[PDB]
Write a protein that binds this DNA or RNA. Structure first.
Length: 175
RNA sequence: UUGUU
């Protein structure tokens, strides 16, 4: 597939980029390797992990299947751990999710879904509830794209006041 | 009691 950067743990601290390139190129064409380093004192030192960027997702997956939880590198007591790098995380849910405040305590997950469905696809919707299942009068709504979240905000923030609520509905990005 | 993942 398209290019992807993988995070790899349980790499010997003594290994350099050259050693890693050789390992990974068995599975696919590597774009570039970056050993994570600690420069807190002299000399800089490997943190025992690296980033490897493959040209294709297919290559990354094949390396993962071959290595992750499978191959134990020299001196290690645990096998390679391999997963997409944090830098590759894209639609963080955190930046797609709305806090909805000042909703009626009678409001159901379905009610909220229905109120906010016109603005996009809702991947998740949860009413916050206390111990006795009583609504805390708020919800989280996750859209699939933050863009749909921003649109719901503009349209729905303080647009109405619901039953029993002291102020209009609150619609904003969640903490 | 405006209650946040």
């Amino acid at each position: 597939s398209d290019a992807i950067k993988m995070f790899v743990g349980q790499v010997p601290r003594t290994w350099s980029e050259k050693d890693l390139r050789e390992l990974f190129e068995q599975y696919g064409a590597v774009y570039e390797i970056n050993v994570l380093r600690d420069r807190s004192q002299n000399p800089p030192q490997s943190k025992g992990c690296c980033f490897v960027t493959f040209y294709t997702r297919k290559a990354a997956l094949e390396a993962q299947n071959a290595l992750h939880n499978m191959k134990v590198l020299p001196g290690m007591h645990h096998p390679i751990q391999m997963k997409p790098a944090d830098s590759e995380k894209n639609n963080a849910v955190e930046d797609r999710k709305l806090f909805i405040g000042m909703i009626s305590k009678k409001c159901t997950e379905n009610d909220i879904r229905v109120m906010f469905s016109s603005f996009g696809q809702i991947e998740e919707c949860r009413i916050l509830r206390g111990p006795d299942g009583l609504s805390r009068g708020c919800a989280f709504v996750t859209f699939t794209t933050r863009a749909m979240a921003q649109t719901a905000i503009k349209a729905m923030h303080q647009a109405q006041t619901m039953e029993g609520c002291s102020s209009p509905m609150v619609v904003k990005f969640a903490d």
